């Protein structure tokens, strides 16, 4: 009974240090590891639940689960109900609940055969899910006992391979280590560092299968949890409350798994076009005069800038919905002037509301108190913590009245200063003291029987009391949703205040965040290590349906170097959300603050991003309508090439653009993986060294001097480009161009989505233009999917064709010789001047 292979041992003492005698007294096996692997582990006979009265419904199945021997945790729920729902051909859903008591549940909005088959083990109870096509076991919960106690849930499964991604937010490779890794989900204000619970929690994984198929698993549970990965390979979910609410997504393609997951949690929100421009912020722009000089200095040096930001500097004594009458006396005028120049404005908003001001002197607190918007303690008074303004209360964003109060505070402040979005920081929620000014009571929520591996060893560390009261439940159950609930409140407040698409960037997140807001990776150091770590983290958030993500360009903490800032701006120009942000005590890192050569390299990176904005916007449209990723790992695009599975220091934009950054000091080259096919050097496309890599699926060393980032265009793709501007207000008025990357057979395809860039309900109202581009047999045509006033007058003035083997003797536009074209025999590039409209059918041809 104790003969269990080391890698297959499941921990029977996850709760405490245990002796051999105590371990054997639990009915467990004690075998020291020979050098982590648990010494105390479950025999195959350890008591679990027994399946009884399995029954069939039109939805799927129902059963009773009965435990007859208690576990070592208090308050086992001895009788459970199993519900299995065969929802779609690619989505299986099952729940395990207490049929005698409603338990906390996360609030969530709602040949012919399924891709899965399901069977059950009777005793010990397990759910077994096969992929029907090849018989592969994806889920098998029989591998370890089911635990279901009031404050401890444990469900385990075999994994189909050593390759698993997800379970944000942690500083990790994209593929998680299965070598006895404990991953803790408990939203926490901590500067990103490995092995720590960070700002967000996403209880979703995507698991690769030999051959390139994949499945995903979502545990819809917002409690503090540990996820334990072991090398058998296997996974254990360990949650401190709620229920087991499990979704399995059958793929089979990794991109399909992500789309199926986003079908449940929500497709990403469509950002405004201006949100894809460059953002510039620091902590320390201490006046409107200084903030105006940033825009002036960027403009003078020809650096594009769409959005100027301020941190805490604008506030009166670090209070929300105020501005100081010293440095920021003319704040409204500053923001109005930004709008006059075609730029937008963003500023920080914290959740905590100053509670110490004289009564009647600070409306956000006074009105919050009147309407009962705050998280309360045992006696029903507001829980008071300590943040930037001093003593503060914390809004309860599960309370419908708090949502109305937040809408009013945002709308009233927007009447004073017309800001264009909200930067919501510290929404873990972050507390500078432990729990509250009055400490926390001694109860089972504050001191639970199982404490997951959180930094500081307590649920109260850097946050508010776990037993504090919210409208829907205790903070214990709702903590991991706090940031998400603020993002939802802020999204609605901005819609009501401005009547156009909201732009919310949030530190703390939960599963489904991307439906409402974007994210930045928080207080990263200005280091080569953190530049390199940003690529896996940006890819991970794209898999989790938060495509609007980035890191602080040049890093937040510490002082950047000029070389690091060049490399970080080059890579950061490919973050879907691109902001340079800087800490209070740091040396300046605005693009105009560097040497002339560094400025040139940073200007080129920004110029290329701005040229690509129509393409990036189209990629966001595909995320919003079809649950696609914007920035994606090579394995999402080439899953059948197992060499891609561990690549996380390269990224794709969509299907076609491969970015291979330098991520180390002193390098003038980079080695990157090129999947099978032809990859054209984007340097061969004119914008205002081998021309093509012919890959069999291999590593290629590329020249990468300080002024260069490697970007390659996949053969068979067409990308729309637009002319330059210092803002998207300017760039959106410029003529467009196509980059047409031909296959060997002369084929290529691409698309453009265009709307007014900011209106609500565009797709519902049909207020957009959608065009497909097709290259075939020495011709390029457009196919008009939808043409409306928004996009009709888009000018196409240049067509660049890559992979043209022989110089043409004639180039025609709608049957007439073009005014001008150039062919380069060295690079095989045909560059064509044209006078066309995206919204009217054209035919360009050469021979
Ligand atoms: C629930 O939260 C409320 C605040 O909303 C807590 O009120 C605080 O209660 C403490 C006493 O337990 C007060 O401290 C006292 O202040 C007076 C004078 O200011 C001083 O003479 C006493 O020796 C003592 O320090 C504190 O003022 C009060 N805070 C506020 C904002 O009024 C209450 O304790 C919380 N309940 C629990 C069980 O945590
Ligand atoms: C498993 O189910 C049996 C039978 O329950 C009955 O049939 C079901 C379809 C449903 O309609 C129930 O309401 C019925 O009671 C349970 O055994 C019965 O237990 C009751 C109450 O203890 C007893 O009065 C009956 O005589 C039993 N019937 C038989 C045929 O044995 C049984 O308890 C269920 N098991 C578990 C673990 O819940
Ligand atoms: C699901 O996992 C369970 C438990 O690991 C597997 O069942 C064991 O299989 C071993 C090896 O064949 C047997 O000797 C044991 O008797 C089984 N244990 C139990 C509790 O039945 C099971 O094979 C897995 N199922 C599938 C389809 O892979
Ligand atoms: C960041 O740099 C701060 C200022 O450093 C001083 O000024 C610049 C221009 C350099 O010449 C430097 O050598 C000077 O010492 C420091 O006060 C601060 O400690 C630095 N932070 C870190 C984390 O190194
Ligand atoms: C929040 C955020 O992480 C950071 O970018 C911001 O500049 C500061 C100041 O507002 C905040 N840091 S924190 O207060 O320490 O959480
Ligand atoms: C703007 O540049 C001027 C002139 O170089 C410089 O003195 C000033 O400090 C800069 N201001 C900011 C905010 O960068
Ligand atoms: Cl034993
Ligand atoms: Cl014990
Ligand atoms: Cl791995
Ligand atoms: Cl008012
Ligand atoms: Cl309620
Ligand atoms: Cl509850
Ligand atoms: Cl390899
Ligand atoms: Cl290698
Ligand atoms: Cl025309």
Author numbering: 81 to 115, 123 to 197, 204 to 781, 794 to 952
Give the exact sentences the study uses for this entry.
Retaining α-glucosidases employ a conserved two-step Koshland double displacement mechanism, in which α-glucosidase substrates are hydrolyzed using two key carboxylic acid residues functioning as the catalytic nucleophile (Asp518 in GAA and Asp412 in CjAgd31B, a bacterial homologue of GAA) and catalytic acid/base (Asp616 in GAA and Asp480 in CjAgd31B). Mutations in the gene encoding for GAA can lead to enzyme deficiency which generates multiple phenotypic forms of the lysosomal storage disorder (LSD) Pompe disease (PD). Herein, we report a 1,6-epi-cyclophellitol cyclosulfamidate as a new class of reversible α-glucosidase inhibitors that displays enzyme inhibitory activity by virtue of its conformational mimicry of the substrate when bound in the Michaelis complex.
Structural data for the rhGAA-sulfamidate 6 complex clearly revealed that the cyclosulfamidate with the oxygen attached to the pseudo-anomeric position acts as an electrophilic trap, yielding a covalent complex with the enzyme and adopting a final 1S3 conformation in the enzymatic pocket after covalent reaction with the catalytic nucleophile Asp51831. The interactions of the cyclitol moiety of sulfamidate 6 are essentially identical to those observed in the rhGAA-sulfamidate 4 complex, though the sulfamidate moiety engenders steric constraints on the active-site scaffold. The bulky sulfamidate, liberated from the cyclic restraint of the cyclophellitol framework, pushes outward Met519, Trp481, and the associated loop region. The energy cost of this structural perturbation is compensated for by several H-bonding interactions between the sulfamidate and rhGAA active-site residues, pleading for stabilization of the abortive complex. Contrary to the previously observed inactivity of the galactose-configured cyclosulfamidate analogue toward α-GalA,26 cyclosulfamidate 6 in turn proved to be an irreversible inhibitor of GAA with a KI of 378 μM and kinact of 0.35 min–1. In comparison, sulfamidate 6 with an oxygen at the pseudo-anomeric position showed to be a 10-fold less potent lysosomal GAA inhibitor, with comparable activity for the GANAB (IC50 = 112 and 47 μM, respectively). Thermostability assays (TSAs) showed that α-glc-cyclosulfamidate 4 stabilizes rhGAA with a maximum shift in inflection temperature (ΔTimax) of 11.2 °C and a half maximal effective concentration (EC50) of 1.16 μM, whereas α-glc-cyclosulfamidate 6 does not prevent enzyme unfolding at increasing temperature. Kinetic and crystallographic studies of rhGAA demonstrate that the position of the endocyclic nitrogen dictates the reactivity of these cyclic sulfamidates, and whereas cyclosulfamidate 6 reacts covalently, sulfamidate 4 binds in a competitive manner, providing a new chemical space for potential α-glucosidase stabilizers.
